Each structure stands twice: as structure tokens, then as C-alpha cells.
Amino acid sequence: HIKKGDNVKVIAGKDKGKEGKVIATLPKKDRVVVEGVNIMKKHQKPTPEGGILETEAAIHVSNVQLLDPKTNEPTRVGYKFVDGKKVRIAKKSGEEIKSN
Amino acid sequence: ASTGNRRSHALNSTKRRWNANLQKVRILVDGKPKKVWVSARALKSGKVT
Amino acid sequence: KAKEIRDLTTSEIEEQIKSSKEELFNLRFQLATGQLEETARIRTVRKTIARLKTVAREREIEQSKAN
Amino acid sequence: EARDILKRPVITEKSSEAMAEDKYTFDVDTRVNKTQVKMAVEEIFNVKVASVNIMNYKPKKKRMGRYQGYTNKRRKAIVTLKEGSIDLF
RNA sequence: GAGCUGUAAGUAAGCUUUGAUCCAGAGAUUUCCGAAUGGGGAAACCCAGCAUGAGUUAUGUCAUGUUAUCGAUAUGUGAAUACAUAGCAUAUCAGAAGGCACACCCGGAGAACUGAAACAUCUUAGUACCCGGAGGAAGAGAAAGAAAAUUCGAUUCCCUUAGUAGCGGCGAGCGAAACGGGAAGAGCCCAAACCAACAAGCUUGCUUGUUGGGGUUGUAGGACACUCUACGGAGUUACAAAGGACGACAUUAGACGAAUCAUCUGGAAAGAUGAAUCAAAGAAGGUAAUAAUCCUGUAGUCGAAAAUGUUGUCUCUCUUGAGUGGAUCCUGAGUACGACGGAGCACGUGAAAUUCCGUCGGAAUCUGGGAGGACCAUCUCCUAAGGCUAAAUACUCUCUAGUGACCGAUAGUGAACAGUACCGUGAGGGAAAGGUGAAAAGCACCCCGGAAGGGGAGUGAAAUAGAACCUGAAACCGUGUGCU
RNA sequence: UGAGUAGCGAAAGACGGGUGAGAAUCCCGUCCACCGAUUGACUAAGGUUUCCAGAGGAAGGCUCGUCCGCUCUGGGUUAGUCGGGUCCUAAGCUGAGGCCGACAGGCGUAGGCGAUGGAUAACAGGUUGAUAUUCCUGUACCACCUAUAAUCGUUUUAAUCG
Ligand SMILES: [Mg+2]
């Protein structure tokens, strides 16, 4: 489960192996947007004259994995209660720095 | 006044009623006397005029 | 705003309702003549009026039980 | 009650040419009579009302993509005043 | 615990880590009609009285309360009529009224087509329809019973007895019960004799009334006579009733939850090939093809501020129980029965006993009364004419969790997008209509054309996937050709 | 398929100019023709936005269409006196108590409701694309309330009201 500012890795699709970072979330369809991944080309009409534009489209969230902060490998995520508050762990190391 | 059958000699059947022998007499009802319908059998039995 | 409202005395609340209703009237007149451009204020003022009425009914209910 | 009797002003070309005289057009709650309208205008705008006329409008049929319905019914009031003027835009 | 302002896409303007949107519990608000109830009325409207209040020089206007009919409970008053009474008036209470899944249950009233190879007794059938009353069940229920052993011991339901015994234009057809095997199991309160009081007549004797106690049955019990005895038991599901405390479970939101990498083909891998790992978890669904190890989950374990529902332990609240005498007193009356006319019992009035309704008659009192299929005698069993009672049983418009050698868009609900288009004055009848793609990346720009349509270019793995969008049969309509 | 077949729903049009991609069919003009106890002008029932302006031409229009009672966007109905209610009653319908009836319910007294009838105060002119006895100007009338007042004189009576 990934937040808005993390640094992830793509594990499925055309762009498998790229890193990028998250910029949008869309939780109702569970599809994130990652920079430089899944780029599309739109035909926009004049609204100024338009033309072909390139932006990123959303990818399904289960095609993305976080990176172990220490060893820098993909990992799943668990939870832990500290100070009576929930944090994220890397299933291969300790705490996971996710402030922004 | 329940219902029943009238029977012929060939035993054909038709619906029919038995009525009660109601009479209009003046009986003592709470306080003032009133004039109501009462059967003759109930009159012979359990009520005073 | 519900915690801020509960500090007001019962006569301040009436004056506040009377002012919010006027403020809302003016916005609806501006919207009709076509010069408002900030349409999000209309819902805000309506919700404040609803909160004021809720807090006013609470006190009147509560005191009658004590009486 | 006064801010609840008057709903909004009507701005059209007939209403504007009426405003060339001293007549102003309003949409009002559909339950009020013209005496309430007269007393509400005087309280809100601080003027002197000479007269007031009213009329009812039926609901109209209308479409939005194979969805047949009706608009709201409405009540319209025209207020002539003796002294003063109402500032609008 | 980071996004959010319905389906619902946009833009605008905004909200949110000082915790929003969202989920559960409890509150507040809740226009008008409708039993509709101030009066009226063509529902969703019109017109009022009374009392407060705002406003106005004052009227007009507005706001808030209250005002149906029957019923109950008080008070006052009182006609033909003297007392009285019928009425009448005032004030408190809020008892009824209407609706439904009204499926199942209990009552009232009750067909015909049909079968009998016609039809009338009979059958369809006490079925359909209509009306009334209710409950989570209802009804029945504690022997005036079943029987014929050496008996049993309230009721209901299941299996058998058995298509037997019986009934029947002895035709068509209708059709039990006891014994035996099981589910469940529970018993009680009155009326009367009598006693103690109180009260009116009365003459203080009696009568009657009111309260309380007592008391409840068959190989007879109880009153009375006498002799032996006391707070432990009992309880809100009948057996009398209220309400407190502290607990324990279960709902109604949730939380944690093991383990995988690489190459090939490809638009994309979960597939193939190779090497690994978890399992109290290899249910299931998603993810760009087919995943135990990617996501949501699963096995397992944890969790409630608040409101409900059960259930314990205290509290609480009630209350003596035996024996002998047995025939001195009490033990359910227009009742039981009978005649006439009917109905229900498997049973068509018959050898009809047994049980109900209408109309007339009309008992007995323990040496009594009833039943054992006309009746009589002897035997055996029981004790009517007052009432209450859980469980085992029936049903599903619903709610929660699941299941299927059930359907897969002419099927399955009439209805996957509707009791809607539409038809009918009305009651009423009643359709047709699912699929772009993995992702809108939904075709910028150029050309012909008024547009609609099209040809290129571009997106895409694919555009003969371009929205009349998966696949795209046949009938049918065309264009070009080899032989004729 | 029948088949480019039957039909295209009573009738008089002609020409010039205009607009348009496109005109027998739309707009303007002249001439001609038809109705005229009516194909003219008012008010009711009934319908329910069909009304007006700007834009449009896929479907509807028995042809065409640049037009439209069709599609899109925005507008339009003003009352003390007009017709109803806050007035009256007819037939009829309901009906407190009441009478009758297996149930359901049927009838009916006082009283209500109910116009198609009785009562009842406004006319002339101006003005819009779309309303007018309603808006504007002029001149009226009818109810009700308060002030300013002669007449008012126990409130029997008297003026008054009843
Ligand atoms: Mg062909």
C-alpha cells in the first residue's frame, strides 16, 4: 500500500524496471500515476491551437512495489504500533521513512 | 340465527335460516327502563320486565 | 464552528442568526444579477445557520429537563 | 420572514423597460399574498410602495436527453413605489 | 487516516492532518395530503371561531397555540311533571378509528364448470371468492376419557396400523381409530359449605349486601370433630406481583495476518523453461493471457465510547404442613335430557350410539348422576353444566451468513437497461431494449463538400475494434467474370 | 413478391423582384379569382404552452422547402368594480342523535353541500414582438377604519338601534 510521495518500482507492463515516483492516487479505482510511466499522446483541439500532447496515464496499483530503504529491493509492507500509532515496515528491514 | 338446509322428498337441498322468537318488551336496563328485543326463551329464563 | 458557538450567550445567537440570514439574502441577489463569482459562500452560510439553530435548540431542550 | 418571502429579482427586457418607470419585478414564495409582499419590500429596502400586482405561472414541460419532466411553478410580483428607489445591477 | 463536493463526466468556486469525505450508535429538524379529526372539498386546496403576540392613528395582514365523533372520569343543571328522569353544559384523560406479505391460524357466510361416460341423491368441496378477529404462532389441553390387560393416566405433532374396519343411486367415489414406536413434557385457579368483620332494612332475631379468610375432589374430596406440627421453600412463561445491584455472553463499525526471482514468446505473463519459498492459510475475486508467494483476502488471533438482546449471582417479594372420623352440611338449573326441524362427526337419520344450532317442553342430589354404538339387567371406567396454561407443530413480504451435476439476454422475474412507452371513460391490460478498448489514448492537422458523409495523416497489438462500436450465420440486394 | 404499380383527402391562379448551395412550393408587389345568415367578428366547453423573438433543417409535413402548430435557446398571462370564492337556495348527494339489517351495510330527522337560476360597485382614450374594462392618463363608484365636527340628552323613553 503506497502513498502519494513514495519512490516505487514497476513490476509489470511495458515499463517494468523503471522507478519514478507517485504523483496521483485515485483510490476508488486503485490506480496510481507515476512520473515517466505509461505515457500517452492526445489529440487536443484548439480551445490556442492544440496538437499532440504527452502526459502519463494511471497504472493499476498492484503493478507497483515499494523499495527497501536499506538494501534497495522491492518488498511488501507490514504494520506496527509505536506510541499507540501505526507505522510501515519493509518486511526485510525496519521503519520506512514516508513523510513526503 | 344460524343456517342450514331445507330438504325435499327427493333429498334436494336449499339454504335456509332459523330465526329466534324475538319479542319487544320493556326491561330494566341500567337506571332507566328501555324497550328492546328479547327472545321468548330468554324471557322465560333469566330476565325481569 | 460548533465549539465556538457554544460560548455565545443565548441573545448573541439570535443576533448572529439574524445577520447570517441577511448575508445569505444578499448573496442570492448578487447571483441573480450575474455578478457573484464566489458561489461557495452560499453553502457555507447555510451550514452556519443550521449549526446556530441546532445549538439554540439544544439549550432549550436541556433546560426544560432541569425545570 | 421578509428575506424568505422575496426570492430573487427578474432581469429581462420587459422588466427593464418597466424599471424605466418605478416598477420592480420579483420572484416570491408561492404561498404568500400581495399584502405580505408589500410589507416585505418596505422592510427590506426602506421605501414606500404604491401598489403591487401578482400572477401565477404553470410548470412547463422540458427535456434533457430522453428525460421528460417539468420546471417549478412560480409566482411573480410587480411592485410600484411612490418614493425611493432600489439599487440593483 | 488522505483525499473530498450523489449516479456524473466538466468548469468554476471551495473544504481538509487544528483530521475532511466515509462507516456504526444515539439525538435534533421533519413543508403539504392522507384514518385526517376546526368547517367544506373535484387528495396534495379553499374558508373560519377563540386565546395570546408583532405591527398599524386604527382597520386590513401576519405568527404561535387550541377547536371532530363516539368512549371514560368529575361537576353543575334540568322538559312534558311536584320530586325525579331523558336530556343539556363545563373540565380533565387520551380508549377506539386506518394499514398490512394481513402467507400461516381461528371464526361468519358459501358457488359453478367438473366426475358419475346423460342426471336429480352423491362428487368437485366446506374448495374459490367475500366479511370479521388476532399472534409470532394460533387452535387444543388436565378425563362425566381410552379400554376389556395383570390395564393406561392432559393436549398437540411424526411413523405404522391401512387403502384395513366401515360409509355409498352398496354406483362414481369417500375413508378412520385404539394398541405399538418416537419428538416434547407441567400443571393450576375459582363458585359453594364455613368463619370473621362492616352496612341497610329490620327488630336487633332474621334477611340481604360488601371485604377478607377457607376451599377445591371419585376406591369420593372439602367443611366440621379431634390429634401432630413451622420459615424453609416459591416466584414474575400459567400457578400473585416491582424493581434494584454486580457480572457473562451475543449482535450492531473494525485491526493484525506467512511466503518469488530470472529468461523466452508477446502489446502486455500469472503461460513455457530453470532454480526457490510458505502452509492451522492450495476458499474466492482482481491484476494488460491461466498467480498459494503482486493486490483485496483466506486459516488464525485481537477489538466497543454507545444502544439493544439474552443469561447468571445477590437483592427483592410471597407462603406452615400432616393424620383419623365419612356421609351431619357443601359440591356449577331453565342446566342435563326429551320431541320436531337441521348440521357436524370417515359415516347419505340408519341398529345410529356420540357432539352442536332454532322452537317448544323439562330432572335427580352420593342409596346421586354419566359412558361402554337401539333397549334392559349385571359388571368396568369416570364425576358434566366455571376459567387459565410453556414445549414438541405451520408460514416467509423480510434481515444476516451461505449453498446448487439451477438460467445465461426469445432464457432467468413482466422487469440485468418497468408496473414505465403505450392501450382503455373505468375496473384493468401491458412491452421492446446488455457487450469499443488493457487504458479514452474517442481520430491534432490537410483535402472535396452548405452540411451529412468520405480520402489521407495520426492513436492503438488490432479502426473491415470509430460509438448504429466483441464474434457477425441465413433469407434478401448488388458489381465483375469462366462455360452456356 | 405484387411494383416503380394503386394512391398523394372536395377548389384558380399568373408574372415581376428578393433571399439562398439549392425555389412551381419561402418573403414582398401588382393583377386575377372564391366566401360573405359567412370560409367574417365575439363568448362557452375541451385541449394544455401549441403563444412571441432569434437560430435550424436529421426525423415529422402524403411532393419540395431557405418554411412551420417540428428541433434549439431565451421570453410572455398584472383586476376592490370582468367570471368564481369570503352571499342565497333547486334537483340531487350527504347526514349528529335515530330506524332496520348474517357480516359487509341500507334508509332517514335537524343541519350541511350543490348553478344551469336570484343578489351584487368602471367607463373613455393611449400603449407592446407577445397582456389589457387588469398596465398608463383622465374622470368615477362601492364597502370598511380612524380623525374633524352642528343634530344626539334617565336611555323606559327619546333621536338611536332592535
Ligand atoms: Mg441481387
* CB nearest D89 (choices: C21, C28, C35): C35
Q: How many CB atoms lie within 10 A of CB C67?
A: 5
Q: How was this structure obtained?
A: cryo-EM
Residue keyed to cell 328479547: B38
Q: Are strands A39-44 and A51-56 parallel, antiparallel or unpaired?
A: antiparallel
Q: Which long-range contacts (CB under 8 A, 24 or more apart) does A12-18 make?
A: A12/A63, A13/A38, A13/A59, A13/A63, A14/A38
Region label for D41, one of left (φ > 0), alpha (ψ between -120 and 50) or beta (otherwise): alpha
What per-residue string of b and e applies to B17-36 under the rule 16 or more CB within 10 Å gives b?
eeeeeeeeeeeeeeeeeeee
- Is the CB of residue D37 less than 8 Å from the CB of residue D54? yes
For residues A78 and A91, give the distance between their C-alpha atoms in angstroms, rounded to a whole number.
6
For residues C49 and C19, give the distance between their C-alpha atoms in angstroms, rounded to a whole number.
10
What per-residue string of b and e applies to C3-29 under the rule 16 or more CB within 10 Å gives b?
eebeeeeeeebeebeeebeeebbebeb
For residues D49 and D79, give the distance between their C-alpha atoms in angstroms, rounded to a whole number.
7
- Is the CB of residue C64 less than 8 Å from the CB of residue C58? no
For residues C66 and C60, give the distance between their C-alpha atoms in angstroms, rounded to a whole number.
10
Nearest CA of chain D to the CA of C7: how many Å?
27
Cα C56–chain centre separation: 10
HSE-CB for A51 with a 13 A CA cutoff: 3
- Please report, for chain C, the start and end positions of each structural domain, with discontinuous segments joined by +: 1-67
- Please report, for chain A, the start and end positions of each structural domain, with discontinuous segments joined by +: 1-100
Name residue B34's beta-bridge partners.
Answer: B27
Protein CB footprint (7 Å) on chain F nucleotides: 48-50, 71-73, 75-79, 102, 129-130, 134-136
D64–C contact, CB cutoff 8 A: no
- Give me D1's grid cell: 420572514
Name residue B25's beta-bridge partners.
Answer: B36
- Give me D78's grid cell: 410587480
How is chain C classified by DSSP, letter by letter?
A: -HHHHTTS-HHHHHHHHHHHHHHHHHHHHHHHHT----TTHHHHHHHHHHHHHHHHHHHHHHHHHH-
